Short mmCIF file of C-alpha atoms in Angstrom, two decimals:
data_model
loop_
_atom_site.label_atom_id
_atom_site.label_comp_id
_atom_site.label_asym_id
_atom_site.label_seq_id
_atom_site.Cartn_x
_atom_site.Cartn_y
_atom_site.Cartn_z
CA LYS A 1 -17.43 -2.20 -2.13
CA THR A 2 -14.95 -3.81 0.13
CA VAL A 3 -12.47 -5.78 -1.92
CA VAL A 4 -12.79 -9.47 -0.99
CA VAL A 5 -9.30 -11.08 -0.48
CA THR A 6 -9.09 -14.90 -0.51
CA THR A 7 -6.49 -16.48 1.56
CA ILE A 8 -5.29 -19.82 2.64
CA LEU A 9 -4.47 -20.77 6.22
CA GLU A 10 -0.64 -21.47 6.49
CA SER A 11 1.86 -20.51 9.24
CA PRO A 12 3.58 -17.98 9.32
CA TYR A 13 1.69 -16.48 6.15
CA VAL A 14 -1.68 -16.18 7.97
CA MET A 15 -2.61 -17.73 11.33
CA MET A 16 -5.06 -17.30 14.08
CA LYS A 17 -5.02 -14.53 16.66
CA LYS A 18 -4.87 -15.48 20.37
CA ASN A 19 -8.16 -13.70 20.99
CA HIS A 20 -9.70 -14.34 17.70
CA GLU A 21 -12.77 -16.05 19.15
CA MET A 22 -13.84 -12.49 20.67
CA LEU A 23 -12.09 -10.65 17.74
CA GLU A 24 -14.32 -9.82 14.71
CA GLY A 25 -13.39 -8.74 11.18
CA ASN A 26 -10.06 -8.71 9.46
CA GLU A 27 -8.40 -8.47 13.00
CA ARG A 28 -9.07 -12.16 13.55
CA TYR A 29 -5.95 -13.23 11.61
CA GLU A 30 -2.23 -12.37 11.86
CA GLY A 31 0.74 -13.19 9.62
CA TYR A 32 3.01 -12.30 6.99
CA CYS A 33 0.13 -11.67 4.39
CA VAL A 34 -1.95 -9.93 7.03
CA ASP A 35 0.41 -7.13 6.96
CA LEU A 36 1.20 -7.61 3.29
CA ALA A 37 -2.47 -7.06 2.42
CA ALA A 38 -2.45 -4.10 4.68
CA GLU A 39 0.58 -2.24 3.02
CA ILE A 40 -0.84 -2.66 -0.49
CA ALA A 41 -4.31 -1.31 0.84
CA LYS A 42 -2.92 1.84 2.04
CA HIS A 43 -0.94 2.47 -1.19
CA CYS A 44 -3.71 1.81 -3.42
CA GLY A 45 -6.21 3.33 -0.87
CA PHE A 46 -8.99 0.98 -0.63
CA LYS A 47 -10.71 -1.17 2.01
CA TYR A 48 -10.09 -4.93 2.15
CA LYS A 49 -12.04 -7.94 3.68
CA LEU A 50 -9.82 -11.16 4.42
CA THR A 51 -11.60 -14.51 3.89
CA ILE A 52 -10.50 -17.93 3.88
CA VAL A 53 -10.99 -20.44 1.02
CA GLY A 54 -13.62 -22.92 1.77
CA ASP A 55 -11.79 -26.01 0.25
CA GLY A 56 -8.36 -24.95 1.77
CA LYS A 57 -6.42 -25.70 -1.45
CA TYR A 58 -3.99 -23.72 -3.54
CA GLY A 59 -5.53 -24.43 -6.81
CA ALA A 60 -5.02 -26.90 -9.52
CA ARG A 61 -6.72 -27.62 -12.86
CA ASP A 62 -8.91 -30.91 -13.04
CA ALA A 63 -8.41 -32.48 -16.39
CA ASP A 64 -11.48 -34.27 -16.49
CA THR A 65 -13.96 -31.41 -15.88
CA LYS A 66 -11.58 -28.28 -16.42
CA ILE A 67 -12.38 -26.66 -13.12
CA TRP A 68 -10.14 -24.35 -11.12
CA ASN A 69 -10.11 -24.48 -7.38
CA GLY A 70 -8.37 -22.55 -4.55
CA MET A 71 -7.07 -19.09 -4.86
CA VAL A 72 -7.35 -19.16 -8.68
CA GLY A 73 -10.70 -20.78 -8.76
CA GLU A 74 -12.15 -18.11 -6.58
CA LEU A 75 -10.56 -15.34 -8.83
CA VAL A 76 -11.62 -16.60 -12.17
CA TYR A 77 -15.34 -16.89 -11.47
CA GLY A 78 -15.46 -13.64 -9.36
CA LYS A 79 -15.79 -14.67 -5.62
CA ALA A 80 -12.84 -12.47 -4.85
CA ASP A 81 -11.13 -9.51 -6.38
CA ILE A 82 -7.46 -10.27 -5.28
CA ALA A 83 -5.48 -13.17 -3.61
CA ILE A 84 -2.99 -12.32 -0.90
CA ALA A 85 -1.29 -15.69 -0.17
CA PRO A 86 1.76 -17.68 -0.97
CA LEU A 87 0.71 -18.66 -4.31
CA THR A 88 3.40 -20.00 -6.59
CA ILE A 89 3.97 -18.42 -9.98
CA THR A 90 3.50 -21.11 -12.36
CA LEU A 91 2.76 -21.34 -16.18
CA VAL A 92 -0.52 -22.87 -15.86
CA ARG A 93 -1.94 -20.23 -13.39
CA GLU A 94 -0.34 -17.35 -15.28
CA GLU A 95 -2.40 -17.96 -18.48
CA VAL A 96 -5.64 -17.84 -16.36
CA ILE A 97 -4.96 -15.00 -13.80
CA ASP A 98 -2.46 -12.09 -13.41
CA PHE A 99 0.73 -12.57 -11.11
CA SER A 100 2.50 -9.50 -9.71
CA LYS A 101 6.16 -9.31 -9.42
CA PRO A 102 7.33 -12.09 -6.83
CA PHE A 103 7.40 -10.61 -3.16
CA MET A 104 9.38 -13.75 -1.91
CA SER A 105 11.93 -15.73 -3.64
CA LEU A 106 12.23 -19.35 -2.64
CA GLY A 107 13.44 -22.65 -3.92
CA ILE A 108 13.91 -26.32 -3.06
CA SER A 109 16.13 -26.80 0.12
CA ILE A 110 17.36 -29.59 2.11
CA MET A 111 16.30 -30.45 5.68
CA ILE A 112 18.32 -32.41 8.12
CA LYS A 113 18.20 -33.20 11.85
CA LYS A 114 20.82 -30.73 13.20
CA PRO A 115 23.33 -32.46 15.55
CA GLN A 116 23.32 -31.83 19.30
CA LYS A 117 26.94 -30.80 19.26
CA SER A 118 29.16 -33.29 21.15
CA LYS A 119 29.74 -34.11 25.09
CA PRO A 120 32.90 -35.96 25.48
CA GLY A 121 32.62 -38.47 28.51
CA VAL A 122 34.63 -37.63 31.38
CA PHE A 123 36.62 -40.75 31.06
CA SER A 124 36.92 -40.61 27.32
CA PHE A 125 40.64 -40.80 27.29
CA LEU A 126 40.28 -44.59 27.63
CA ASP A 127 38.24 -44.67 24.31
CA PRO A 128 41.38 -45.93 22.24
CA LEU A 129 41.24 -49.13 23.82
CA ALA A 130 38.53 -51.64 24.87
CA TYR A 131 37.41 -52.21 28.32
CA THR B 1 25.99 -12.53 34.08
CA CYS B 2 25.48 -8.80 33.33
CA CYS B 3 24.97 -7.35 30.05
CA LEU B 4 28.01 -5.21 28.77
CA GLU B 5 27.99 -2.43 26.05
CA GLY B 6 24.29 -3.23 25.28
CA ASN B 7 20.83 -1.74 25.17
CA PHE B 8 20.03 -3.28 28.54
CA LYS B 9 23.61 -2.69 30.04
CA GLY B 10 23.77 -3.45 33.69
CA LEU B 11 21.23 -6.27 33.77
CA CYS B 12 22.73 -9.28 35.82
CA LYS B 13 20.74 -12.16 34.51
CA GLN B 14 21.12 -15.29 36.70
CA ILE B 15 23.02 -18.16 35.00
CA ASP B 16 20.78 -21.01 34.36
CA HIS B 17 22.66 -24.34 34.87
CA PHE B 18 19.84 -26.68 33.83
CA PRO B 19 18.53 -25.99 30.39
CA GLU B 20 15.33 -27.96 30.46
CA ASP B 21 13.93 -26.38 27.43
CA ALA B 22 14.07 -29.15 25.36
CA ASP B 23 13.44 -31.68 28.27
CA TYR B 24 16.57 -33.75 27.84
CA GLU B 25 18.65 -35.62 30.31
CA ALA B 26 21.22 -37.44 28.08
CA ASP B 27 23.55 -39.35 30.53
CA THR B 28 23.79 -39.35 34.27
CA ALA B 29 27.37 -38.11 34.30
CA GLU B 30 26.24 -34.72 32.56
CA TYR B 31 23.53 -34.25 35.20
CA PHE B 32 26.03 -34.83 37.93
CA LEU B 33 28.61 -32.24 36.32
CA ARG B 34 25.84 -29.83 36.02
CA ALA B 35 24.52 -30.09 39.47
CA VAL B 36 28.39 -29.80 40.70
CA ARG B 37 28.82 -26.68 38.69
CA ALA B 38 25.58 -25.06 39.84
CA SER B 39 26.33 -25.53 43.43
CA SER B 40 29.88 -24.14 42.99
CA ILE B 41 30.82 -26.70 45.87
CA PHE B 42 34.47 -26.89 45.07
CA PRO B 43 35.48 -22.90 44.96
CA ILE B 44 33.35 -22.73 48.00
CA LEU B 45 35.03 -25.64 49.61
CA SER B 46 38.40 -23.98 48.79
CA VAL B 47 37.41 -20.74 50.44
CA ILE B 48 36.29 -22.71 53.55
CA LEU B 49 39.58 -24.61 53.59
CA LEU B 50 41.55 -21.37 53.25
CA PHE B 51 39.52 -19.93 56.16
CA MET B 52 40.22 -22.88 58.29
CA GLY B 53 43.90 -22.81 57.68
CA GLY B 54 44.07 -19.15 58.40
CA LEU B 55 42.39 -19.76 61.68
CA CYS B 56 44.68 -22.59 62.46
CA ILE B 57 47.65 -20.34 61.73
CA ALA B 58 46.18 -17.67 64.06
CA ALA B 59 45.63 -20.15 66.81
CA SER B 60 49.01 -21.58 66.38
CA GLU B 61 50.41 -18.39 67.94
CA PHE B 62 48.06 -18.92 71.28
CA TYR B 63 49.17 -22.59 71.58
CA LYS B 64 53.06 -22.67 71.20
CA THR B 65 53.51 -26.11 72.55
CA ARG B 66 51.07 -27.82 70.03
CA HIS B 67 52.97 -28.04 67.01
CA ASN B 68 50.25 -30.36 65.22
CA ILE B 69 48.15 -27.12 64.49
CA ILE B 70 50.68 -25.82 62.06
CA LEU B 71 50.61 -29.17 60.24
CA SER B 72 46.83 -29.04 60.06
CA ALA B 73 47.04 -25.47 58.68
CA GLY B 74 49.46 -26.77 55.94
CA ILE B 75 47.13 -29.66 55.15
CA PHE B 76 44.24 -27.22 54.96
CA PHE B 77 45.96 -24.99 52.54
CA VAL B 78 47.05 -27.89 50.18
CA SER B 79 43.30 -29.15 50.11
CA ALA B 80 42.31 -25.81 49.25
CA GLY B 81 44.64 -25.71 46.42
CA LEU B 82 43.32 -28.93 45.26
CA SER B 83 39.70 -28.06 45.71
CA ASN B 84 40.43 -24.74 43.57
CA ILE B 85 41.96 -26.90 40.81
CA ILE B 86 38.87 -29.11 40.79
CA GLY B 87 36.76 -26.02 40.57
CA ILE B 88 38.55 -24.64 37.73
CA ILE B 89 38.34 -28.04 35.88
CA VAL B 90 34.70 -28.46 36.50
CA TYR B 91 34.00 -24.86 35.46
CA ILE B 92 35.72 -25.03 32.17
CA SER B 93 34.25 -28.38 31.44
CA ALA B 94 30.68 -27.20 32.11
CA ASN B 95 31.38 -23.92 29.96
CA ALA B 96 32.36 -26.12 27.01
CA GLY B 97 28.64 -27.42 26.99
CA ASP B 98 27.43 -23.89 25.60
CA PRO B 99 28.58 -22.62 22.47
CA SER B 100 29.08 -18.91 23.67
CA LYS B 101 31.57 -20.15 26.46
CA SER B 102 33.31 -22.40 23.80
CA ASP B 103 34.42 -22.11 20.25
CA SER B 104 37.42 -19.68 20.63
CA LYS B 105 37.72 -19.62 16.98
CA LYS B 106 34.83 -17.44 16.30
CA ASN B 107 33.54 -16.54 19.75
CA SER B 108 36.88 -15.59 20.97
CA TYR B 109 35.92 -15.63 24.56
CA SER B 110 38.16 -14.08 27.17
CA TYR B 111 38.72 -15.07 30.82
CA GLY B 112 38.46 -12.02 33.23
CA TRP B 113 40.35 -10.95 36.08
CA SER B 114 38.08 -12.52 38.62
CA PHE B 115 39.14 -16.06 37.05
CA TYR B 116 42.71 -15.13 37.16
CA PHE B 117 42.19 -14.11 40.80
CA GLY B 118 41.18 -17.51 41.59
CA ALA B 119 44.28 -18.90 39.51
CA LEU B 120 46.49 -16.57 41.48
CA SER B 121 44.78 -17.75 44.64
CA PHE B 122 45.72 -21.35 44.02
CA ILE B 123 49.42 -20.37 43.45
CA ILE B 124 49.60 -18.50 46.81
CA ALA B 125 47.76 -21.20 48.68
CA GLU B 126 50.28 -23.73 47.37
CA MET B 127 53.11 -21.38 48.23
CA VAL B 128 51.87 -20.82 51.79
CA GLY B 129 51.37 -24.50 52.17
CA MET C 1 18.51 -27.13 10.39
CA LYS C 2 18.65 -25.74 6.73
CA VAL C 3 21.89 -26.60 4.69
CA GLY C 4 23.19 -25.38 1.27
CA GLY C 5 21.46 -23.24 -1.22
CA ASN C 6 18.26 -23.49 -3.14
CA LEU C 7 18.28 -26.06 -5.82
CA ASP C 8 16.02 -24.00 -8.15
CA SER C 9 14.39 -20.53 -8.17
CA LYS C 10 10.65 -19.83 -7.67
CA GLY C 11 8.55 -17.08 -6.08
CA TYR C 12 5.19 -16.13 -4.51
CA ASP C 13 3.18 -13.53 -6.32
CA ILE C 14 -0.02 -11.55 -5.65
CA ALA C 15 -2.81 -13.15 -7.55
CA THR C 16 -5.22 -10.90 -9.63
CA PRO C 17 -8.15 -12.00 -12.00
CA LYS C 18 -7.16 -11.24 -15.77
CA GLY C 19 -8.20 -7.84 -16.92
CA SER C 20 -8.62 -5.93 -13.66
CA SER C 21 -8.23 -2.45 -12.50
CA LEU C 22 -6.03 -3.49 -9.48
CA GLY C 23 -3.28 -5.21 -11.64
CA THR C 24 -0.98 -2.49 -12.23
CA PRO C 25 -1.29 -0.65 -8.90
CA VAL C 26 -0.61 -3.87 -6.96
CA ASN C 27 2.35 -4.77 -9.26
CA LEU C 28 3.84 -1.28 -8.52
CA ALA C 29 2.89 -1.42 -4.77
CA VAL C 30 4.96 -4.90 -4.50
CA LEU C 31 7.92 -3.47 -6.01
CA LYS C 32 7.78 -0.32 -3.84
CA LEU C 33 7.63 -2.48 -0.79
CA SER C 34 10.66 -4.51 -1.85
CA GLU C 35 12.66 -1.35 -2.75
CA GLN C 36 11.95 0.26 0.68
CA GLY C 37 12.58 -3.05 2.55
CA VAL C 38 9.15 -3.46 3.99
CA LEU C 39 9.02 -7.08 2.65
CA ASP C 40 12.28 -7.77 4.00
CA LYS C 41 11.24 -6.53 7.58
CA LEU C 42 8.08 -8.39 7.39
CA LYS C 43 9.84 -11.71 6.57
CA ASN C 44 12.24 -11.11 9.41
CA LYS C 45 9.32 -10.26 11.74
CA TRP C 46 7.35 -13.63 11.05
CA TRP C 47 10.38 -15.79 10.67
CA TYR C 48 13.29 -14.73 13.33
CA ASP C 49 11.83 -11.74 15.49
CA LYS C 50 9.13 -14.17 16.39
CA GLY C 51 11.33 -17.24 16.31
CA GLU C 52 11.91 -19.54 19.23
CA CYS C 53 15.47 -20.53 18.72
CA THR C 54 37.60 -26.23 17.93
CA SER C 55 40.66 -28.08 16.31
CA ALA C 56 42.66 -28.08 19.30
CA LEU C 57 41.79 -30.76 22.22
CA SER C 58 39.73 -29.17 24.93
CA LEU C 59 39.73 -29.73 28.60
CA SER C 60 36.50 -31.79 28.27
CA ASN C 61 38.40 -34.54 26.39
CA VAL C 62 41.06 -34.93 29.27
CA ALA C 63 39.05 -33.95 32.38
CA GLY C 64 38.86 -37.50 33.68
CA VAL C 65 42.59 -37.71 33.85
CA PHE C 66 42.64 -34.59 35.91
CA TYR C 67 40.02 -35.95 38.26
CA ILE C 68 41.82 -39.22 38.66
CA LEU C 69 45.25 -37.11 39.42
CA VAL C 70 43.34 -35.15 42.09
CA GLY C 71 41.68 -38.16 43.54
CA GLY C 72 44.99 -39.88 43.81
CA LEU C 73 46.56 -36.81 45.51
CA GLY C 74 43.86 -36.82 48.12
CA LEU C 75 44.18 -40.40 48.78
CA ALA C 76 47.86 -40.29 48.97
CA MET C 77 47.51 -37.38 51.44
CA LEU C 78 44.83 -39.38 53.46
CA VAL C 79 47.20 -42.33 53.57
CA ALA C 80 50.01 -40.08 54.90
CA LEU C 81 47.91 -38.65 57.60
CA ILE C 82 46.58 -41.98 58.75
CA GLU C 83 50.16 -43.42 59.02
CA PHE C 84 51.31 -40.31 60.96
CA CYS C 85 48.34 -40.66 63.28
CA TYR C 86 48.88 -44.31 63.87
CA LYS C 87 52.68 -43.82 64.46
CA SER C 88 51.83 -40.89 66.97
CA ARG C 89 49.18 -42.80 68.88
CA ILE D 1 12.61 -5.91 -26.77
CA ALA D 2 15.62 -5.80 -24.04
CA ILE D 3 17.01 -9.09 -23.42
CA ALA D 4 19.87 -8.10 -20.89
CA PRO D 5 20.43 -8.33 -17.13
CA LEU D 6 18.12 -5.57 -16.56
CA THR D 7 17.30 -5.06 -12.79
CA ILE D 8 13.46 -4.81 -12.15
CA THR D 9 12.74 -1.54 -10.13
CA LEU D 10 9.76 0.64 -9.40
CA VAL D 11 10.50 3.61 -11.36
CA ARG D 12 11.22 1.37 -14.49
CA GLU D 13 7.78 -0.52 -13.93
CA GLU D 14 6.10 2.85 -13.97
CA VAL D 15 7.27 3.41 -17.47
CA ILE D 16 7.95 0.10 -19.27
CA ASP D 17 6.88 -3.59 -18.89
CA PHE D 18 9.01 -6.28 -17.26
CA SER D 19 8.42 -9.93 -17.54
CA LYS D 20 8.63 -12.47 -14.63
CA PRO D 21 12.34 -12.75 -13.41
CA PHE D 22 14.41 -15.14 -15.31
CA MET D 23 16.95 -14.94 -12.65
CA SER D 24 16.88 -14.20 -9.01
CA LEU D 25 19.98 -12.38 -7.23
CA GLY D 26 21.07 -10.29 -4.34
CA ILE D 27 23.90 -8.57 -2.88
CA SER D 28 26.70 -11.03 -1.73
CA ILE D 29 30.03 -10.81 0.01
CA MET D 30 33.44 -11.15 -2.02
CA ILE D 31 36.35 -12.13 0.27
CA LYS D 32 39.79 -13.39 -0.77
CA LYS D 33 40.13 -17.19 -0.88
CA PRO D 34 41.74 -18.10 2.35
CA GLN D 35 45.19 -19.90 2.06
CA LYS D 36 47.63 -21.54 4.25
CA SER D 37 48.77 -18.64 6.59
CA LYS D 38 52.34 -18.58 7.91
CA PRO D 39 52.37 -20.50 11.26
CA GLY D 40 52.88 -18.59 14.34
CA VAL D 41 56.03 -18.45 16.42
CA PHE D 42 54.45 -20.03 19.26
CA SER D 43 52.46 -22.57 17.28
CA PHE D 44 53.98 -25.63 18.92
CA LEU D 45 51.18 -25.12 21.64
CA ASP D 46 48.36 -25.42 19.02
CA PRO D 47 47.47 -29.17 19.57
CA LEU D 48 46.36 -28.43 23.11
CA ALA D 49 44.01 -25.80 24.16
CA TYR D 50 45.28 -22.91 26.46
#
């Protein structure tokens, strides 16, 4: 049957279409993974259905009960056959599910408030001395 | 401003002098300078003063006994040169606001012949004055 | 704004249940997209194509002195004409 | 086992197996390190803009 593809809502990976209220099917969502899931489908020649995870979480092992949620939890227990999402490749997730080669390389970066250039005052030549 | 050597070459997009995309006002002086540039009041005033000086010179021939007309023409020419100077200063100052018209190190903006026509117009008007 | 380079290296991967028939074909597909440049184009489309965004002293630093000079020239001219008109009258 | 800077490509995946990339890289630009250029003839006008 159609392959169920679990996905998490995150811009610009997947977002909501402008007319998604009237739209139905996989066309309801647009984003990076929407086309990413499309390109793999044509190459592998299969039909896919895009679905959003119920809990809206990426996935993390719960040490108390040993339960997996999110992308990985759906895959291990069989709700979905493939996850098309910005899922980080980690050691804990690799021993549970299969990760392909990375399609996007990232890392920790620094965000700062960019300066708004500079607008010298008209009478800024009087700056060296006080009023 | 019209596109050059581009896909949409020939598209003369109007210059927006009030970039209210971010809804910012900053200080009153910046708004006043932006309004002064947008109306181009000083180059237009220079043109008007040059026209008045020319008409005074033309009317000076008709009224030979009235020497005060020639003085008025000279005053108009000098004021036109001063207004042209103010217009050039305001134009360059407002141009410094946007990175594309500034940062000659990387952008390497170049002044066209139309700008140098106004620069030459100021010199001639002062010479005639 | 973003400054500098990445502190570390990570990646996003396509997740597939262990022991699945879609494991190998998807992995080959991902590399094929990267080799062809489809992934780079998709990143560009959803980040930049759909995006929404010297040493020498400039004239802006000394514009006020020019304004003062021209205002003084105008005031001096006005004074000269006022004096001339008063003398003539 | 091949422990070497071996690029992961499509044709190699179809034939052998690669692990996850232990180092990420791409094409960059090499330029000569800028140095103090000889001053221009008319470099005394530099402090003020044209």
